[PDB]
Ligand binder design. Structure first.
Ligand SMILES: CN(C)c1ncnc2c1ncn2[C@@H]1O[C@H](CO)[C@@H](N)[C@H]1O
Ligand SMILES: COc1ccc(C[C@H](N)C(=O)O)cc1
Ligand SMILES: [Zn+2]
Length: 866
């Protein structure tokens, strides 16, 4: 498995301009005919090197001459002695039914569908499987009409026919040149929800959502959200859909979330199907965001694509930024920002502190499917957001416009995007570019001084990024550091110096620097790194009173939340140390009082209250520590919940009841109230047993929507309430035939605090609703155990590691992409104590020795074991 390097990019020796594909479809043996029009750009003696995996080659012709000057080698078909311009014809066979990896053309239930990103098209035919080769596709699909009445590919239908022996065919054409990773094919029997969207210039677009039979009842929200996505992109970005038909297919078997194939997106059904009894508010909002994300790729990914895979963030950072802006504009901006910061600080930072650390533009990859990461996506988006902070909306949109003017219809680079933004705005991003090439989380240290004689406030700000295993050399970044200063009534102090305004985004560009502010008439309380203005760790010696002051007075909702997180972090760290000494939780009265104040403040948005009242997750807590003690973290989190539950009991029940809603609506104010209600229920579940048991069981039985039902259920499991087992069996009895709904239940099982969780999980491998053939079930049971129950995963007996090794031993062979996601918790071994580290290393060494170890796993194991 050889590493590939960004610096080794070279333009292709050959282009393909046009490809005509024919599929004689059958689940056991599909025959692919591919007729490509090729053009040599490189040296006249260079062979054409086509990529292919697991293909049975039938024939090779060049201008209809059977060719003799070719050879197959590992991963490749190398064709020699070609003319400058020619027609290549390849016939080859593939076997969809054999494809358990779900890469290429595969079976999902009774349907046939494709996944081609990143390098899946080479599993279908021999091709230039690189995203800087852009070709015009025509696709003819021949199949059994009964089995496959719908035959879909990108674009519009150009031809159709019927054949003997019950076969029929449809031919599609997509006018826009594309890299092969955006090819899609779907064949099956579906229900179809059909609608229309008219663009702002009057183009009528046919919208078509394909779902398995009997799922139309779960389709309208996804269609609503597609329309909302299209409107928003018009309003915010000025972008309109460019084709006549927009197709989405929801499939049950899919490794990732969804896929932006031009005009024919393919979605995991998790990110499509919803009705009020099956889906929670968070499912609704995730469908919204994923529908949006894939639609936004139509411009940022498809009309402008990636020169090479190391440029992935060019489309993914920017399309995540767009999905976040879409959700934030339609819904609660602060709740969005809060949750994206929780992901950054709790999950992304862990990656950046791990053996798999990489810059948002990687330099070295073994298996590109391993680089669809929190870093490339979420840190990628933070980097785009920083450009937006530095430029402002108007200049950022001028940059977007210049980026599309220069690069529409091409495969571009991250550097191209940054150049466009610099050139449009006249903001210098030369130093800023280091964010693309440097891995790891910068640590930003802030000291302050108030001089009452001169009425000046001085911030001394330093930065450093620690080395990471991938990069021994680090340098200072251009860090946009947003501040606000508050007087003692809570009013903002104007920032100025020498008689002139100073921008509140400080440019922190050196290892150390000072910023001096004049006409500061009162000692201020600072709000620092406002709206998480750069993806960094902040070190400032906060008093508890400065933090509770911000919770009361800060102008932006995010700051109030962030101040609450800073206040809790001190006390989480205190109590983890106490747990290690066998001492009970300790929490100052004034800290509990600040959370009481949030409960009783009628002026606070409920959406923001709910988030302040949602404790940091065990992953966020782990981020606070150099060495992670997973059992201490889990138990401290429960104890902190119990303490607050006891101290705030009466207020929690008052706010619980005050936020009752008889009508269920998927509307943002209503969601906010429900999130606050259910935030209170999490604490009330740790009340006196009999009170809690009744409250939680009542909500479970009386709920008129799945948000409320699942909140109750999750509380019964988290607090090990007497009603737990009955409620859990009630749910299984009701919902066992519905795998998406059962995933919620598997997550609850896997994340249970019960002593016997591992035994329960292992027994659920045989559950009627579980199967190792379905990525969503694997994620919901096995993934949630390893990744989201770090306490049971890191059981001192080592049983959690042994369990994961067993499951990876299967998955390595079955589905290496899912295996690679699931090994992540073992690759974090150097964050744990020595005894755990030795057990985790033994597990990794077992896996390193597997027969037929996948490249996907090999990459991660060898970084981990270094
Ligand atoms: C589809 N959208 C909205 C995504 N938004 C954010 N990250 C994603 C997405 N799709 C895939 N990813 C990334 O790939 C990984 C799957 O766990 C996630 N890390 C995620 O950040
Ligand atoms: C291995 O299968 C896939 C790989 C990547 C994706 C992500 C999709 N482009 C997105 O950004 O949502 C989807 C599937
Ligand atoms: Zn994407």
């Amino acid at each position: 498995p050889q590493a590939k390097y960004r610096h080794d990019y070279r333009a292709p020796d050959y282009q393909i301009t046009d490809i005509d594909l024919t599929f004689d479809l059958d689940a056991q043996k599909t025959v692919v005919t591919a007729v490509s029009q090729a053009v040599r750009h490189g040296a006249s003696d260079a062979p054409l090197r086509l990529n292919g995996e697991d293909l049975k080659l039938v024939s090779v012709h060049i201008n209809d001459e059977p060719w003799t000057a070719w050879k197959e080698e590992e991963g490749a078909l190398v064709i020699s002695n070609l003319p400058e311009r020619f027609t290549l014809k390849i016939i080859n066979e593939i076997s969809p039914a054999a494809n358990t990896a779900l890469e290429g053309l595969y079976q999902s239930g009774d349907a046939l569908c494709t996944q081609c990103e990143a390098e899946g098209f080479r599993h279908i035919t021999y091709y230039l499987d690189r995203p800087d080769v852009l070709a015009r596709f025509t696709t003819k699909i021949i199949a059994d009409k009964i089995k496959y009445p719908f035959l879909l590919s990108n674009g519009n239908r150009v031809a159709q026919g019927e054949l003997e022996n019950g076969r029929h065919w449809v031919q599609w054409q997509d006018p826009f040149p594309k890299p092969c990773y955006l090819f899609a094919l779907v064949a099956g029997d579906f229900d179809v929800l059909r609608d229309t969207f008219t663009t702002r210039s009057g183009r009528e677009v046919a919208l078509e959502l394909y779902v398995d039979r009997g799922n139309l009842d779960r389709a309208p929200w996804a269609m609503t959200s597609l329309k909302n996505s299209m409107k928003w992109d018009e309003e915010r970005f000025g972008l309109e859909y460019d084709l006549d038909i927009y197709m989405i297919v929801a499939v049950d078997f899919f490794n990732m979330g969804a896929m932006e194939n031009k005009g024919l997106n393919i979605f995991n059904s998790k990110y499509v199907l919803a009705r009020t009894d099956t889906a929670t508010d968070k499912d609704y909002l995730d469908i919204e965001r994923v529908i949006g994300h894939e639609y936004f790729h139509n411009w940022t990914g498809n009309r402008v694509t990636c020169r090479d895979w190391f440029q992935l963030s060019l489309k993914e950072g920017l399309t995540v930024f767009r999905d976040q802006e879409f959700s934030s504009d339609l819904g609660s901006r602060a709740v969005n920002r809060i949750n994206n910061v929780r992901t950054m600080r709790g999950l992304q930072f862990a990656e950046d502190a791990s053996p798999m650390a990489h810059p948002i533009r990687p330099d070295m990859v073994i298996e590109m499917n391993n680089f669809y990461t929190l870093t490339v996506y979420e840190k990628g988006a933070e980097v785009i957001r920083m450009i937006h902070t530095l430029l402002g909306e108007e200049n950022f949109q001028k940059g977007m416009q210049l980026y599309f003017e220069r690069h529409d219809g091409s495969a571009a680079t991250c550097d191209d995007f940054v150049q466009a933004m610099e050139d449009a705005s006249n903001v210098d991003l030369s130093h800023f570019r280091r964010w693309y090439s440097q891995s790891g989380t910068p640590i930003v240290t802030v000291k302050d001084d108030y001089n009452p004689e001169t009425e000046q406030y001085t911030l001394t700000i330093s930065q450093r990024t620690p080395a990471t295993p991938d990069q021994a050399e680090k340098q200072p970044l251009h860090i946009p550091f947003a501040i606000e200063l508050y007087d003692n009534e809570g009013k903002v102090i104007p920032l100025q110096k020498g008689g002139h305004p100073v921008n509140s985004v400080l440019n922190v560009t050196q290892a150390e620097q000072t910023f001096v502010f004049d006409n500061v008439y009162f000692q201020p309380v600072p709000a620092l790194l406002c709206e998480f203005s750069a993806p960094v760790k902040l070190e400032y010696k906060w008093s508890d009173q400065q933090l509770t002051f911000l919770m009361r007075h800060a102008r932006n909702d995010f700051s109030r939340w962030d101040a609450a997180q800073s206040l809790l972090a001190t006390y989480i760290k205190l109590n983890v140390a106490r747990h290690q000494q066998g001492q009970p939780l300790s929490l100052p009265v004034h800290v509990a009082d600040a959370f009481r104040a949030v409960l009783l403040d009628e002026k606070i948005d409920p959406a923001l209250a709910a988030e302040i009242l949602t404790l940091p997750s065990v992953n966020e807590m782990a981020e606070l520590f150099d060495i992670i003690d997973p059992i201490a973290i889990a138990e401290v989190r429960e104890a902190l919940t119990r303490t607050l539950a006891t101290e705030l009991a009466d207020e929690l029940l008052a706010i619980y009841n005050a936020n009752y809603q008889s009508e269920y609506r998927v509307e943002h104010e209503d969601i906010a109230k429900r999130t606050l209600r259910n935030a209170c229920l999490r604490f009330l579940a740790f009340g006196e047993t009999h009170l809690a048991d009744v409250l939680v069981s009542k909500q479970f039985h009386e709920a008129n929507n799945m948000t409320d039902a699942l909140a109750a259920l999750s509380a019964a499991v988290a607090a090990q309430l007497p009603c737990r087992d009955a409620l859990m069996q009630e749910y299984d009895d009701k919902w066992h035939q519905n795998g998406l709904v059962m995933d919620k239940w598997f997550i609850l099982q896997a994340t249970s605090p019960a002593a016997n969780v591992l035994e329960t999980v292992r027994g659920l491998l045989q559950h009627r609703s579980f199967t190792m053939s379905n990525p969503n079930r694997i994620r919901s049971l096995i993934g949630a155990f390893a990744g989201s129950n770090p306490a049971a995963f890191h059981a001192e007996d080592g049983s959690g590691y042994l369990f994961l090794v067993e499951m990876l031993t299967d998955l390595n062979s079955r589905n290496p992409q899912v295996a690679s996601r699931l090994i992540e918790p073992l690759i974090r071994l150097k964050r744990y104590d020595a005894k755990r580290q030795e057990k985790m290393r033994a597990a990794l060494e077992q896996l390193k020795g597997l027969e037929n170890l996948s490249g996907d796993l090999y990459e991660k194991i060898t970084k981990a074991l270094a």
